[PDB]
Design a protein around this nucleic acid. Sequence first.
DNA 1: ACCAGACACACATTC
DNA 2: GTTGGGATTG
DNA 3: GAATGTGTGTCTCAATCCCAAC
Length: 537
Amino acid sequence: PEPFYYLHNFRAVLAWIGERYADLLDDQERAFIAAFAELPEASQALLVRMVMRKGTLFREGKLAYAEIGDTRAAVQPLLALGWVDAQPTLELAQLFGLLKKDELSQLFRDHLGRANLRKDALLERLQPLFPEARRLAEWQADFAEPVYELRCMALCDRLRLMYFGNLWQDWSEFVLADLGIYRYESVEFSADSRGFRLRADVDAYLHLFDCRQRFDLGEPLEELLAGLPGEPYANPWLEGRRVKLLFQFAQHCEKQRDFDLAQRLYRQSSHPGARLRAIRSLERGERFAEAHALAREASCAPESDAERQGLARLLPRLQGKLGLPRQARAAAPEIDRLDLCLAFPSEPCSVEWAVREHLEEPGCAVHYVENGLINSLFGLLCWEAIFAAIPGAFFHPFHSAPADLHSADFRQRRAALFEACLGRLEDGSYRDAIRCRYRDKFGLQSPFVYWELLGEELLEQALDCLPAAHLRAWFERLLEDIPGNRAGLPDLIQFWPAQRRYRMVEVKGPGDRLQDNQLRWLQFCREREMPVAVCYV
DNA sequence: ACCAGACACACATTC
DNA sequence: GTTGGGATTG
DNA sequence: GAATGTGTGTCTCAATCCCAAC
Ligand SMILES: [Mn+2]
Ligand SMILES: [Mn+2]
């Protein structure tokens, strides 16, 4: 309805920062917000376009908007302020990004030009010839169009990182929200600001991101570790990311064959499952000695239910290749292992979708829900428990879930609420509770509540067949490890309404063999005498 | 939940 | 001349 | 064939487009 939707939403961000994050701003950055308001309606619009767009540099032909008048006119106030820069200095690398493949051939006609292979390969070709950067006028002085470079991107991304609690979300969040595509729970403005404590937390987040940026963009390890720290962080979720960065770094040291580094690195990170990869890295360096000594420290005090699974695998192999005795390990009994061989030639329909078709009977129906039913059914019961605001949970409106979810204190900071809601599960009114929370909070962008899947018909069936104790067992387990137990469950779930009873079943072809996350789920089920099975084809 | 978990799929190797 | 991935769009 | 690793492919609103693709 409003052509300047992107401008109004951009104003809404700077307005939010002026209100709440006033003291967290700097002298020259306050001047930016003030000066921005003093730009024409057209020049405010033209600026924000170049931000939302991916690139930093912009060919004038690509900045053709109708909301804004003449692009060459509305840009002038930005060129005056220096926020935009005409006649910018750019490299051969980012010159390719602006020009088409055809135009590049004309310019480099008699300067080593062959029948091109690939654009990224052409860049690799003109690296040593034109290493130094120049202005556009210095590459093709004859070139007609002007190119605008955005000088205030660093400033912009700071305001974005402050509005949100991260950088992964972009300005599209406003559009997708206003259009009703993403509907969020209007959590109350309780913790007015846990965006950040001081600027120190921002620069930390920002410089870590720069290393990540300089990693995908190929740069050697010795360069990226020079700026990194050996000392951990104080801010909880910030320390978690630095750690998570070291993890993704160690992966590359193992993807390529340099296990000495990967191994030494995995131990410096307190990331989930990093301890394991340190052992598997030693294993793959003929370091069985220190692989076992470390594996012992894990055996004496594991990291999670998943870690325990890894040790059972690794220990016999290390103990074996060492002089030690091969300590025995455990295995799972294939519960209700049903099999069926149906042969057909053509139709490429989904495998899991086809099994749903076969189990269909006049007495029982089956739904294709891999970790979907129990997740949503949990996220509704403990809905109000999750979206309750702690002093450092929520801050901006467009948030999917409470920020302290991956933190181990997620259950502790809500230990009261979760126990109040879960009380209903063994007590009465677990059906009346879910229903009210189903109708009231429908369609919202909640974690582990897949609305688009859970239909009104399915829900009522599950509530009857799925018993109190089994729901009482499942949900409690998710709370032990939320990031860990969110995945790995039976593809299908069947219900027998008459003599109320259900049964979950994972379906596999011979080409598959189930995963570690699913295996851990089948164990938990057989232990509690939960009707479950595996189906082969 | 920061180009990711989250399913199958495809290779290798070993008691 | 093809076709399809990805920045762009609201 | 069992059970092991590890390495790929797929995909997040949907309709538009243009530029570089084997
Ligand atoms: Mn599945
Ligand atoms: Mn399956």
